[PDB]
């Protein structure tokens, strides 16, 4: 045989990692460099933009770290976009730009800074950075918390970044991870970036599946056909969406209805029950043994 590794001794010496690390959600190496503030700042919050793209949604939050836990000043989710006209495709790059733009304008509107710091209303895709206006409240500033996402060129977390800076957030960044930075020649053409922002890269893919195979097209886009969003009206849909966001970024929570107060989960068994089951298991094991005897 072979010696057992996971024995009594193994667990006596085992030191678990942090809960968020055992679950695989937080990189505490990068978090230590992100959240903590210089000691000569004294409770000056260090805001950071949290972008987490999931399978069916895009979550953009802005938080600053406190001792008891991060505090979210405002958040914008992708599942709100149907209000502003973006019916389907709530996780593509063009949707990420909207969620970032929504988060920006929603934050500024809670600071009375929406009139100032408009940003880029006419989206171009170039290297834009808002600078503070003298005599006015300083422009808001945060940093991007990519999390565990591999940050290569064209990652959707940078789409929300572009949406935020065009909304009026002073986020330090470089125009190198945007979709449009040609790697072998080291330049950036804002035009192709403007394509991904207005969702043109997927529009042609619907057009590509037009003459190639329509049945496979119906299989790759079903709710696009269900919501009647053809590649024709996609670019204007986002422009209508952006304008609808900048004019009403306020969020109205859903009305909270009182619920019947039931329990779907299984309550934890008590000691008396746990201790009595053993008496039944042993007794039944005997009263089944003399039946064989």
């Amino acid at each position: 045989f072979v010696k057992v590794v996971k024995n009594k001794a193994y667990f006596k010496r085992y030191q678990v990692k942090f809960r968020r690390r055992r679950e695989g959600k937080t990189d505490y190496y990068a978090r230590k460099r992100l959240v903590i503030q210089d000691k000569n700042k004294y409770n000056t919050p260090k805001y950071r933009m949290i972008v987490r793209v999931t399978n069916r949604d895009i979550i953009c939050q802005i938080a600053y770290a406190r001792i008891e836990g991060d505090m979210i000043v405002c958040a914008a989710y992708a599942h709100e976009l149907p209000k502003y006209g973006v019916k389907v495709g709530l996780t593509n790059y063009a949707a990420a730009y909207c969620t970032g733009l929504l988060l920006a304008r929603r934050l500024l509107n809670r600071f009375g800074m929406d009139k100032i710091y408009e940003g880029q209303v006419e989206v171009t895709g170039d290297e834009y950075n808002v600078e503070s206006i003298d005599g006015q409240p300083g422009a808001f500033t945060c940093y991007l918390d990519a999390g565990l996402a591999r940050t290569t060129t064209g990652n959707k977390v940078f789409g929300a970044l572009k949406g935020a800076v065009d909304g009026g957030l002073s986020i330090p960044h470089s125009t190198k991870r945007f979709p449009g930075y040609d790697s072998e020649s080291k330049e950036f053409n804002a035009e192709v970036h403007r394509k991904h922002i207005m969702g043109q890269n997927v529009a042609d893919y619907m057009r590509y599946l037009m003459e190639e195979d329509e049945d496979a097209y119906k299989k790759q886009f079903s709710q696009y056909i269900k919501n009647n969003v053809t590649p024709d009206m996609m670019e204007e849909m986002y422009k209508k969406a952006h304008a609808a966001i900048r004019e009403n970024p306020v969020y109205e929570k859903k009305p909270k209805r009182e619920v019947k107060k039931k329990r779907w989960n299984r309550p934890k068994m008590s000691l008396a029950q746990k201790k009595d089951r053993v008496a039944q298991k042993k007794a039944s094991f005997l009263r089944a043994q003399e039946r064989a005897a």
């Binding site: 053993v278 298991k281 042993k282 094991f285 005997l286 043994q289």
Partner: peptide, 10 residues
């Protein structure tokens, strides 16, 4: 575990 108790009493 209770299964070891079974192994002795039978």
């Amino acid at each position: 575990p209770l299964d070891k108790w079974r192994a002795l009493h039978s």
